Design a protein around this ligand. Structure first.
Ligand SMILES: NC(=O)c1ccc[n+]([C@@H]2O[C@H](COP(=O)([O-])OP(=O)(O)OC[C@H]3O[C@@H](n4cnc5c(N)ncnc54)[C@H](OP(=O)(O)O)[C@@H]3O)[C@@H](O)[C@H]2O)c1
Ligand SMILES: NC(=O)c1ccc[n+]([C@@H]2O[C@H](COP(=O)([O-])OP(=O)(O)OC[C@H]3O[C@@H](n4cnc5c(N)ncnc54)[C@H](OP(=O)(O)O)[C@@H]3O)[C@@H](O)[C@H]2O)c1
Lengths: 521, 527
């Protein structure tokens, strides 16, 4: 009586919501951690203060001056990592290595943009492309520019990456001079709020540049105006509710959606059991099923393998999944901790029961005793591997996402005329647009060709082969220099991609003028 | 016996809509011209044949092969211009010079993209930027690529540019390998239909690459799927209607909007009545009020001038507006023809009465008899110039667009940039396609343009050194972006190569060096 109620940071001040708030709990032990509440906040003043005071203050700084602030945030978060790992263990139930993906993946992405931003220099707008003549005598020309939007960036973030979900978006928004309002998902909000508190307490950014609201979302979209941008990460259903709001349909504010995705892994026809690419496929499937207990939007959900390879693949995945120990991440023998909440436990188990209506369960370690955890309290789900023998007539295989340590293997028919993986491509496309597909072969040139065939349906194609066993950055790990997003079911969004992320935060304009006026910006 | 019912081109066939159809009429003479109807069409097959056959056939071609098809369309349109000018005179009521903005504007933009497109090369995917190492030893890298979306592009186009609105969209779409379904505005659909009929009858593009539906738009959006794209031009209110549809809210199809825009012209403080930039401002205002009777979305609607220059600017605009004779475009003495319809005529006259409740009418030649037209049949409206002396507290100036030969002048307090108040005033239009700025000092234009750029999709600076070369406040050069934030729709079109992204899917490919090389051999981007 009672755990800490975490304050919101709005209009440059720390303000508590009213009422009892919503308790965040440890998903292994059931302990009450902290509470949130957005009840009673003055949302009009929160958004106006950020839009006017925050934006004016950030726009007065150059890109390089904002990058320097980002670099100062890096050093701050680096110094406080021990506090962040203790929050992540308790609130998210992740192993240290899995919590590093959030915490140190966040810090690495912020540092990447601090470095990119230093290169942009001491200016207040960016050139887009080169100058172009608009006249035979070259007296009149055009230059396109990017200028920071006179709005706010509202981030409605998913539960699985409280730190990286914040920094992957906030690094390009703040480098672009746009003030940020983050709204983390309630169940795991604590790390987000503590990182925002540490950065606000250090006074590195101007008042109004960084705000946080935790608790109910009611009322937030009603404050969004036509120069604002919104970045939503979460379910496709929720996204479709947000898309209908007047902020987007009437006022035209920008929206980015990152949603559900049934990411594929395709084992190439050449990559037979006696070849090194085969073991890289089994290892990457097990890693993407088990890191964060499969709670990445980019995890492999569908693995397509030649018909001839079906049994050796199932045998090899079963042997490797059996080495994944499950339980309390405080125990150094545990390889995989819990899902983020008991509610997500129930949702994952429903989703496993749903898939089992159409697929055979090949591997399920649910009966292996948990390590230092009570299965009636903890939100630990064991790996489950499904096999779908006829993926062409399968419904659920290509439609139903289980956001847990769950994946389905299906065979495809190798094409033996003139790509051998043509059927696998078609099957991946049945996912109706995904964030990522990975492909595995012993032949690097072949992978460049197959990748082009998956590019129109996947925001990223990730090719693993023996030459890069040591250097490939992971199927599900999002490198900030690369695009993150995908068409169709994955939301039609784009994030990251290095400098490509700044466009969402800017307004592009064609300036057409005397050529002298053009030369000097 | 009735006027011609224009057929639709859908699923590779010409099909008539059923019923009596909708009559299009000459807005000067009231003569019935042609009819349209989309009643009874099989929209499911219209969209699937386009998406499947037309998309596969265009994607089998390289960029440079598609560009060469665009170039053959330019030659076909150029040969048929006499027919297009006759249809524009009758259906739109524009002078020859003004009809040229649509017809020759549309052919110029298509030819621009045919030339540009030849530089995209003999490949099926485009390279976006360069490889970036993901590894200390450089064994593993990332290359982004652009692939044509496996969808259709649906164009819902505005009345004012039946030719340019089609080709400014269709050139980058077909260059990108995406099949087109165009739905022109009904009132002026004839030229769009006839240009699509000439092109389809020539067999330049594969079957399914180019379709047209005229008449009711019922049921079109219901056929849009998640890899399709839609490009809308028209009113902000219609755009917000479309945005709510499931095609966008549930299925995520891309949508571009080009909408209402109260575009500004700002006379800089140095550009006093004794200087050359002053006269360039008076001329550009008059041209944008009068070309097509002001029915460009980019026309100047708000002209902001220093307080001291207000009276000389009104005097000078009056004198130049009075040279504009109005009437039948068949008569060579006429400098400005009609609006596109009698419904637009009634909207514009209601909008003029609305503005007049809050502004002084400084010029109006409505009492001058029309040349070879009956003012009670013709949709002609004379130029009207309003003056708003207090634009800070003005309740309509910054919010109400009259899509006719109508503009408002307002003074600003000279100040920081001398034009700071004019920039704030321009921003009160809530986001526009274009602002133009006028000064004798080319060293002053860049700073002021940067201050307008976050609220305008284009900033067009006119000064004496470019009196002979500047391309026009309202004329949309295809190499430059067209679109604007806020009220103007939040969209982007044209901008040369920038127009291709709307029709492609971007992907990051992360792979061994040799796989990056193999995929790179199959892409291109111009130098
Ligand atoms: N694609 C990516 O890059 C990526 C990365 C990580 C995770 N993910 C995704 O993470 C998901 C987790 O999200 P979820 O399935 O648990 O639930 P969710 O419903 O997608 O997310 C809920 C958040 O959205 C808010 N919200 C709901 N309705 C709203 C409205 N009308 N206006 C504003 N906000 C509203 C909620 O606010 P309240 O607190 O008011 O409920 C909460 O903040 C996964 O299932 C997966 O699809 C995606
Ligand atoms: N680049 C640009 O920004 C740009 C360019 C030119 C014009 N404009 C605007 O052009 C306007 C023409 O539009 P408008 O005001 O006459 O009306 P509008 O309703 O906005 O019409 C534009 C287009 O949308 C169609 N349309 C209307 N309602 C629709 C619906 N519910 N579903 C699908 N399509 C629908 C119209 O078809 P029907 O004609 O057959 O009704 C027409 O093809 C002018 O008023 C002007 O304000 C903007």
């Amino acid at each position: 009586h009672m755990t800490e109620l975490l304050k919101n940071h709005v209009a440059g001040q720390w303000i508590a919501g009213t009422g009892a708030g919503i308790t965040l709990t440890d998903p292994v032990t059931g302990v009450a951690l902290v509470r949130v509440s957005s009840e009673g906040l003055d949302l009009a003043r929160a958004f106006s203060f950020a839009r006017e005071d925050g934006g004016a203050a950030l726009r007065a700084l150059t890109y390089a001056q904002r990058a320097a602030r980002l670099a100062d945030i890096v050093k701050l978060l680096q110094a406080k990592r021990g506090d962040y790992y203790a929050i992540a263990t308790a609130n998210s139930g992740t192993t240290r290595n899995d919590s590093a993906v959030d915490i140190d993946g966040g810090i690495f992405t912020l540092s990447y943009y601090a470095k990119l931003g230093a290169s942009l220099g001491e200016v207040h707008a960016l050139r887009d492309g080169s100058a172009e003549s608009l006249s035979k005598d070259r007296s009149f020309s055009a230059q396109h520019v990017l200028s920071p939007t006179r709005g706010v960036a509202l981030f409605i973030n998913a539960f699985n990456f409280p730190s990286w979900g914040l920094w992957e978006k906030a690094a390009p928004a703040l480098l672009s001079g746009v003030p940020v309002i983050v709204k983390p998902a309630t169940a795991t909000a604590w790390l987000t709020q503590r990182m925002v508190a540490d950065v606000v307490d250090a006074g590195i950014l101007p008042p109004g540049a960084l705000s946080i609201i935790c608790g109910s979302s009611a009322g937030l979209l009603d404050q969004i105006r036509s120069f604002d941008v919104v970045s939503f990460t979460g379910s496709a259903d929720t996204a479709a509710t947000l898309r209908a709001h007047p902020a987007f349909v009437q006022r035209g504010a920008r929206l980015n959606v990152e949603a559900d995705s049934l990411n594929s892994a395709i084992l190439c026809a050449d990559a037979t059991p006696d070849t090194p690419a085969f073991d890289l496929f089994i290892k990457e499937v097990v890693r993407e099923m088990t890191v964060k207990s499969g709670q990445k939007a980019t995890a492999i959900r569908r693995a397509f393998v030649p018909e001839a390879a079906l049994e050796p693949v199932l045998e090899a995945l079963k042997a490797k999944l059996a080495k994944i120990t499950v339980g309390n991440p405080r125990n150094d023998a545990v390889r995989m901790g819990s899902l983020v909440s008991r509610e997500q436990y129930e949702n994952v188990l429903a989703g496993i029961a749903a898939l089992r209506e159409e697929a055979v369960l090949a591997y399920d370690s649910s009966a292996v005793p948990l390590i230092d955890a009570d299965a009636n309290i903890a939100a630990c789900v064991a790996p489950h591997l499904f096999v779908v023998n006829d993926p062409d007539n399968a419904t659920l295989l290509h439609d139903v996402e289980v956001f847990g340590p769950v994946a389905s293997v299906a065979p495809y028919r190798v094409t033996t005329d003139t790509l051998p993986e043509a059927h696998a491509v078609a099957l991946a496309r049945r996912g109706q647009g995904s964030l990522v597909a990975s492909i595995y072969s012993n032949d690097d040139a072949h992978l460049g060709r197959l990748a082009l065939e998956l590019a129109d349906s996947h925001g990223r194609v990730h090719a693993i082969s023996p030459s890069v066993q040591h250097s490939q950055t992971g199927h599900g790990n999002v490198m900030p220099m690369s695009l993150h997003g995908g068409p169709g079911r994955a939301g039609g969004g784009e994030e990251l991609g290095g400098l490509r992320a700044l466009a969402f935060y800017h307004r592009r304009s064609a300036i057409q003028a005397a050529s002298a006026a053009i030369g000097t910006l």
